[model samples]
Target: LPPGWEKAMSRSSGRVYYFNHITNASQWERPSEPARVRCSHLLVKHSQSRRPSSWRQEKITRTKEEALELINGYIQKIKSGEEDFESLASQFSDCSSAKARGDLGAFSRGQMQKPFEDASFALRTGEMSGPVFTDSGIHIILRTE
Candidate 1:
């Protein structure tokens, strides 16, 4: 049970529901994050990325030129079906999302960096993007939903 949650029975359906005393909310579903947006990304970092470190390394020093060229190669891999985004992201992406196979799960517009946000938003579902540079790194965004 969460700090302010209690299980309650539905009046008409006889099903269990959850109530949140903290926020005064109730739902038939669990109180976890059961809804969100949909996207995945492949991040490659250079020395200039916002935080010059990631799970893959204690110190990152790839040049911006190197990062872009590397990401460019991934675009080709994806398009040619030699490598899909999920596989490449898990092995090569610099972000923690790699653990989830690069899944950002669900997010809103303002929650993301503009460089990445605009690029992610512009992509229609199933549309993969070219290189998009954010403070985090060079990214290949895939709008899955």
Candidate 2:
């Protein structure tokens, strides 16, 4: 097994896999290759600053508390399996990534904003993170690698 791997069985498949903390990927024992990190996020912008110049006319729509509530509600839905991260992000995220089901694709360390990278790298695969605040906005992240 890879380092820090915890054994788990697929809910539907009944197949065994190993989940690793350091790389946040899952694998069967035979191949032993590191998997790429995939993440999706819902961004609720808190300010107009740092946005694209063309979007300068836009204003912050929700208060910080309101944004927090919205994100938390989605988190709950995900936890209960009543909703999914992709669906919620596509419906609510302010970022253009919503068009792609909030997919941020694969990224390595240091490629994103410090706060965003920190929050993302901390999650385990198939895990959903709570809201994370950065200079741009509040983010709800899901690690799908």
Candidate 3:
């Protein structure tokens, strides 16, 4: 686990949890500026959960750019704080537990994604967190503190 962090859950022994699953594959890759723009548009459309307007896959130019952009978008979502844990996790989490609202159950040090571990440990019970970036994406942590 990252330093300066500890679990906050009381009944669960200070263990922190993500209400969503983590993603398995990193789809981001080197993409071009135009590609980035296209992806941004696609993402907005996808968020609507509607059928794609077109079948063409938007080509990305630089993976790093894609990663950065995707993470930023995730940060926006986390910051929104309007999403319910289970609902957001199921729709967005990359982990296998997506079906379970990204719930990792009770965990201790070194048991979760690195960023997640750091953020989870840093939170107090009943305290809501801002956006925290991880390799998986941005996270909005809510502690029992």
Candidate 4:
């Protein structure tokens, strides 16, 4: 891809869409500016991550499959309204910010990793997102502000 551009499947459209990580823009045919949004996110770090250990665990030895499955379950419960995003994130997210309910606070366009920013920008306020994977882990993002 032409730098920071990623091709991903869009569930709503039932087709593949292109997104630019650098600008956090979807439909970006090589054009855009940057915008910021605030989001709270739940992350699931695996053994292959850039840094595996988290405040939750001393050594995360789960395979990528395990991490993905965990995130999937998180999304399912949130979607079903069985639990709120913050509560689950605070209790289980691999990200250290879990204590504050996975609050990532204000996001500048590029402060986070590529996939992380792309996923966050794709959401509207009060929206929950699909699984997001970064070098650090898989994530379930909730754009709150």
Top candidate, metric TM-score: 4
lDDT value, candidate 3, whole model: 0.41
Estimate the lDDT of model 2: 0.70
* Poorest lDDT segment (10 consecutive residues) of candidate 3: 33-42
Score residue 84 of candidate 2 by CA lDDT.
80
Q: Write the per-residue lDDT of candidate 4 for residues 1-145, one digit (tens) a residue.
A: 6556688888887777777554344551432213888899888999999999998899999999999899888887887899999999999988779999999888878588988877777666775667777899888888887
Candidate 4 lDDT:
0.79
Residue 72's C-alpha lDDT in candidate 4?
A: 82
For model 3, the superposed segments whose C-alpha errors exceed 4 Å read 1-82, 128-138
Deviation of model 3 at 14, angstroms: 36
lDDT of 3 by residue, 1-145 (tens): 2223332333544544333222111112211101110000012122222232222223323344454565456545655665555565566544455566555555666566576665565544443444455543444555432
* lDDT for position 104 in model 2: 95
List model 2 lDDT by residue over 1-145, tens digit each.
Answer: 4344588898879998766544344555632322346799988775432562213225665567776787778777977889988998887787878888899999988688776776577666876666777766778878888
- Residue pairs with backbone atoms closer than 3 Å in model 4 (clashes): none
What TM-score against the true fold does each predicted structure earn?
0.73, 0.68, 0.42, 0.76
Mark the regions of model 4 whose C-alpha exceeds 4 Å error after superposition. 1-34
Q: State the RMSD for candidate 4.
A: 6.0
What is the lDDT for 118 in model 3?
Answer: 54
Q: What value of lDDT does candidate 1 attain over all alpha carbons?
A: 0.79
